[PDB]
Design a protein around this ligand. Structure first.
Ligand SMILES: Nc1ncnc2c1ncn2[C@@H]1O[C@H](COP(=O)(O)OP(=O)(O)O)[C@@H](O)[C@H]1O
Ligand SMILES: Nc1ncnc2c1ncn2[C@@H]1O[C@H](COP(=O)(O)OP(=O)(O)O)[C@@H](O)[C@H]1O
Ligand SMILES: Nc1ncnc2c1ncn2[C@@H]1O[C@H](COP(=O)(O)OP(=O)(O)O)[C@@H](O)[C@H]1O
Lengths: 489, 161, 489, 489
């Protein structure tokens, strides 16, 4: 039999099928619209998200006909923090999905820093007071609809990030559930108590009647007719798991839409003194482990911008070719602060900028500089992951869409000064959610039956250009300073 | 009926027949790049029955989209190329049915393309099926065998690496 | 010391320096405007041509300072057939250069076929009654200026193709000379008598007072202050010479602006019964040899069109990449009959066309099909060179701008079914003109001192796709039929 | 109250709301993928079609909140001829939608011409033996699935074009219905008997158990929960109706994806002796009227090709600007035979082609020539509509996406030599389906309450360039000859 994985990305919706070994038999992906109502804002349509994620589901199974009774279970991985609020009864959303990227709620984060409620939230959630997290996105939806909050005490409407959104639609409204890794990302959840924090619920005034039942990452939570829905983890926490980074000090970086670097820390919650987040991840059976994290908002979403709005490339694959036509970027820096700067900066008001322009700078210099910022951003948070930990990575394990760019992986190797290990399985976010489902449904009986599938296909070592490393990076560092606090407030 | 659910009587590098038929000389094929070994050297097979098989143990490389020819590479480093008939892309794959996929690991005798010799005798320019080593530079000695062959059983070429 | 080479192309002007071994020490190139006054017409400005060819000359010598007295001689290679007529006294042209490509004089070629003057001109010149050749381009300049012909008997104005144009400007008007290979291309020259044909001068009424002194390919014809001007050959006849194709049956194909394939035949003039031309080439010392030829108008000039007018690529180098993104051309054929169809068709009225279009055909299918027509055209005249000769080439020696496209060279190998030999010296047209100059000036004492410099750098053999060869080519063949005789007359 | 219109195009899915006057209050449109499995083939996914048409429905109502009980009825307009076959029980399609454009079944049309079954089908259906129509697309789906036809006598699976597909999904499978205009387009329907033709069912062997109940264009056929589904017409027959072309001799041309020109003929079925079709249309209450028709496959779908595959424009709106940068097309012709040539040619094997190319031809010449072929194609079938009728249009009433191109409307005026009337309501296909629904549901009580809404906003008269008319058109005429019968058979 097989296990199905729903992996609902910030930009795409992909379903993927696995056999009992671990193989990918079919992968369907269905990209959808990004809604920007005002400049620092991003939004998806909750229905366009479910429309796409269903299409994919009823597409992998048909692609090679197989259905309902050759399938053990369903795992769910999803993009984190984007908040949805819907009418329980009608199953209709009272707004659009305010995405993780969106900067709309910076004013609410300011009131929260004014109050001196800064140290409480880093301590009890591991997070930062920043628009990224779910918490204050729920306050904004309630503060902009008329009567939504009273109606939320009377229970007519309820909250959820994308994992609880999708399972509700799949289980005709019956079960309404989050897992631990996904709940932690809301700023409404205590990471110690492992349950919704009630001061954090009071300062933003969310009725606890809205919230889900935070269940666990491997466990059957309901059925699906469309059959056991048994796994859930935030896509970055399941990618750490498909990478089998299930013991302490083990880490990976995903070059997806943004770049997310996490490191398992086991049973200990480590306080970041260097701009990182303390989140929750899974241990070898799907239990609560803590992790350390750096979130940058902007990796391959920058290549999406050169292709769709700027129209400089046609494919994102073409970025490798035009970038290796020039040799250097002529002095140009690109800071992709399109939705502010994530870790370790955490600046809501920073915007994207291009720097050092001269008349001889052409489009290949801009394309090469966009690819370079993915690498420099990764150096910013890696440099921070060592100061917080103590560990020194001598290799870097990667995954994502963008790891198929050989120039980026090599440039990443030179600017870092470490080796960069690349798997022949690029799809490890889906796999991490599937192992998570197979586990609960007795399909696998833990990770050692999956160890012999982490082939590390290509390896990237520092060539002789790694001697420019610091010179190149000091130009990136003075470039970021100047994109900081652009938006006035 | 059909016999594949039934176990078969079973079993210097050999190249086992991709097809059943009589051997013909590669230089007796009416197409100059085969007849004069430009694309490689080896032999042709005048086919007698409906399927082409994996000729060695290796990985399939390219099945053409008209499904009349495939390339494979034995783990003993040999690239063989099997091509049903000559100027067969004109038929636009009409008589073929692709059984396997391009990156596919295989063993000797595993089916790769099934055909319909009654339609193909009736429509192709020629039905003779060249099987050449397209990496002749890499090989020392080549001995060609003769007579009747049967698909997946009888040897046709012995190479020495 | 050094020898300088002026190589004045249809699109570029390039000067190149050689030491006593054979090396290229410096190469300057200066591209210029193509003037299309009406659709089937092409024209260059005689002054824009000399302006560029001087710039280059006074640029290679400076590029690495060397001047006038470290230089043995100057060789001249030039694009063939384009006619210039100028005021002897003022050194000012009474028109623009009517290029070889230009179709303007098709009506005059029709009167010449009406008269039954078809077999006379193939016999005495080796050429075809076609707008390509110089002859009737001179009649059109004289028939459109008022009084130009009477003034040409009184000697105020004189004729020349680009070799005699450039040497006149370099020798302040003193010497006015053509060589044998360049004179033969005019349709005004007997290839047997090796002097201007006087029936051909009467039917088009050119005063013999206009013509140059047809001197020879290696011989000092004058000095240059700007110093012995000692070599001249048409660029396709000097490329045959840089390729050391100096004995019979030896041949090469240039993928330049057009594709020109020539084969040395020694002391014999072979009659083409298959649409080829009987021209003149050099033998081992620069003496008259005859050659066999196929001229196609349209090779890399088609890639110039996708870059400049269509704007589909930015570099001509980019054609390899986008063409190898697709695998096939989806059924699309491109017939580059922009200036009619050269050999073996010789149709003035054929125009360019794209064929087999479907909604799924994208720009990479068109780019790949443009590169493919260069290869199919070369198959058309190679197939003809064997029927006229008897020889069967088992390899193909090449040179040109476009031979650096590895996809084209490989596709050429598969569609032909022969090997394709490629030199590490791409610049053999210049070199062929320089050896030609070194010879006369005692700098080299013949070709065996230059044999050990024909390294054949990359070799291209027929891969397994050569089995599509004929199927692919039969689609090209029915495509050409339909671009034929588009222009009405 | 309001009436809702579902208008499911070949490329887009659009829903539009109307008040009791006639106004458009909201219009949502959701474009979807075109699948080309092989070159002359087009396919849509039945589920991607319903997915989009539902999204739109549950989007106009929300866009300005209104739902279920401020709405009188639902009208359905749809693209014609594309065949779907599905599992009655599972509501899952046994294939993709073989589109009207698709050329896949040309071989079956050949057997039908071999049999001498040519005059029977023009007589009893009004149609031509061509892949366009539905009939033989159903035979191909049945002849390629294993067991589909026996299963079709036992009733497990049934046929439908897009109107019966959409209403089935909306009415949970209960009602399975076509209207008269939509049924006539299948080649399986007698236009005289006004019921499925049983010889046409035998020669292609379709079980009559598959077919729908051909109901009428205005009539409540079922309810929808999602409420009376009361109107249905093929999008070209509803555009004739929104144009109030409801009396004989009245006509319109739609410049949509293809160009469809129809003329009401009232109670008489006129035999076309000039390559047109005899179809069915509505009369003032939604009754059977006959019509005369010219279908060209290729109008704004050609501008979709320059934008998506060629990438020459970014918007289809940009075609007006780049086309009016040049003044002429330099001699270039574009024949958009991407899916063969429709009326009056009816050539399955013709493919798209570009003609008359020269080195000075740029991308604006190609863009302007693509816009020109829309106009020349319209002249081909208008010229035919007069020979079949006797009428001479002194104006041309238009509608569609592409009528917002002022250059095209003006060029259409000059090449025709008539005035071109343009409405300020571009959306008349939806409106024609809505009036059709309002009628049955007692919401309007016929067309005179809607006459005062046919304002003819801009009028286009022949400027002085209409004197080139015939010269320009004779170049189009010899261009089409050469794109004919490209595909070999
Ligand atoms: N060759 C490439 N070079 C750079 N970026 C790429 C390349 N291929 C894909 N991308 C980017 O990677 C992203 C897709 O990554 P992926 O991990 O599959 O999705 P997600 O970020 O939604 O989880 C897109 O933003 C895409 O632009
Ligand atoms: N990579 C390439 N692929 C195809 N065509 C090319 C490529 N590089 C250059 N070209 C074409 O080759 C031509 C230049 O060839 P060259 O022999 O140096 O000049 P010429 O034709 O004037 O003698 C140009 O028309 C250019 O577009
Ligand atoms: N300004 C324009 N110029 C030319 N074509 C246009 C223009 N605007 C839209 N189009 C084309 O019109 C078509 C949309 O027409 P429409 O009638 O709304 O849809 P349909 O053909 O699906 O019924 C598209 O094919 C689009 O490319």
């Amino acid at each position: 039999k097989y296990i199905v994985a729903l992996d609902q990305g910030t930009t795409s919706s992909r379903a993927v099928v696995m056999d009992h070994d671990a193989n990918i038999i079919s992968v369907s992906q269905r990209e959808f619209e990004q809604i920007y109502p005002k400049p620092g804002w991003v939004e998806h349509d909750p229905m366009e998200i479910w429309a796409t994620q269903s299409s994919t589901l009823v597409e992998v199974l048909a692609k090679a006909d197989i259905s309902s009774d050759q399938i053990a279970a369903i795992g769910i991985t999803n993009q984190r923090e984007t908040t949805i609020v819907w009418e329980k009864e009608t199953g209709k959303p009272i707004y659009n999905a305010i995405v993780w990227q969106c900067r709309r709620t910076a004013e609410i984060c300011e009131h929260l820093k004014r109050d001196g409620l800064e140290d409480y939230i880093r301590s009890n959630t591991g997070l930062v007071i920043d628009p990224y997290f779910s918490g204050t996105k729920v306050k904004w939806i309630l503060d902009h609809v008329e009567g939504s909050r009273e109606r939320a005490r009377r229970g007519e409407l309820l909250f959820g990030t994308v994992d609880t959104w999708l399972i509700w639609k799949m289980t005709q409204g019956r079960v309404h559930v989050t897992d631990y890794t996904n709940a932690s990302r809301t700023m409404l959840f205590n990471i110690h108590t492992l349950d919704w924090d009630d001061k954090m619920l009071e300062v933003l005034d969310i009725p606890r009647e809205m919230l889900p039942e935070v269940r666990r990452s491997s466990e059957v939570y309901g059925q699906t007719n469309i059959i056991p829905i048994s796994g859930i983890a935030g896509d970055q926490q399941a990618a750490l798991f498909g990478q089998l980074c299930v013991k302490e000090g083990m880490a990976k970086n995903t070059y997806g839409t943004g770049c997310f670097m996490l490191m398992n820390t086991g049973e200990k919650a480590v306080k970041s003194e260097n701009g990182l987040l303390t989140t929750i991840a899974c241990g070898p059976t799907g239990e609560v482990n803590y992790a350390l994290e750096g979130a940058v908002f902007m990796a391959g979403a920058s290549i999406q911008w050169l292709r769709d709005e700027m129209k400089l490339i046609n494919d994102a694959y073409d970025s490798e070719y035009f970038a290796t036509k020039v040799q250097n970027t002529n002095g140009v820096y690109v800071v992709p602060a399109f939705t502010g700067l994530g870790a370790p900066y955490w600046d809501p008001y920073a915007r994207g900028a291009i720097f050092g322009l001269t008349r001889g700078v052409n489009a290949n210099h801009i394309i090469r500089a966009t690819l370079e910022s993915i690498a420099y951003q990764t150096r910013d948070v890696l440099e921070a992951m060592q100061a917080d930990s103590g560990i020194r990575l001598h290799a870097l394990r990667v995954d994502g869409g963008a790891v198929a760019n050989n120039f980026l992986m090599q440039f990443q190797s030179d600017i870092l000064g470490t080796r960069v290990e690349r798997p022949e399985v690029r799809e490890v976010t889906a796999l991490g959610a599937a192992y998570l489902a197979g586990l609960a449904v007795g399909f696998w009986q833990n990770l050692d039956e999956l160890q012999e599938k982490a082939v590390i296909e290509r390896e990237f070592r520092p060539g002789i250009e790694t001697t420019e490393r610091n010179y190149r990076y000091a130009g990136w560092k003075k470039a970021v300073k100047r994109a900081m606090a652009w938006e006035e407030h | 009926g059909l016999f594949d659910k039934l176990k078969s009587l079973v079993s210097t590098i050999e190249i086992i027949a991709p097809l059943s038929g009589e051997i013909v000389n590669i230089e007796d094929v009416p197409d100059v790049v085969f007849a004069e070994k430009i694309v490689g050297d080896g032999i042709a097979i005048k086919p007698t029955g409906n399927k082409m098989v994996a000729p060695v143990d290796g990985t399939i490389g390219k099945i053409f989209e008209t499904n009349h020819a495939f390339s494979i590479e034995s783990d003993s480093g040999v690239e063989l190329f099997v091509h049903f008939g000559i100027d067969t892309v004109e038929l636009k794959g009409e008589g073929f049915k692709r059984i396997a996929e391009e990156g596919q690991r295989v063993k000797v005798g595993d089916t790769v393309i099934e055909f319909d010799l009654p339609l193909l005798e009736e429509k192709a320019k020629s039905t003779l099926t060249p099987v050449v080593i397209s990496n002749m530079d890499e090989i020392k000695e080549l001995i060609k065998l003769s007579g009747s062959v049967t698909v997946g059983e009888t040897p046709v070429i012995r190479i020495k690496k």
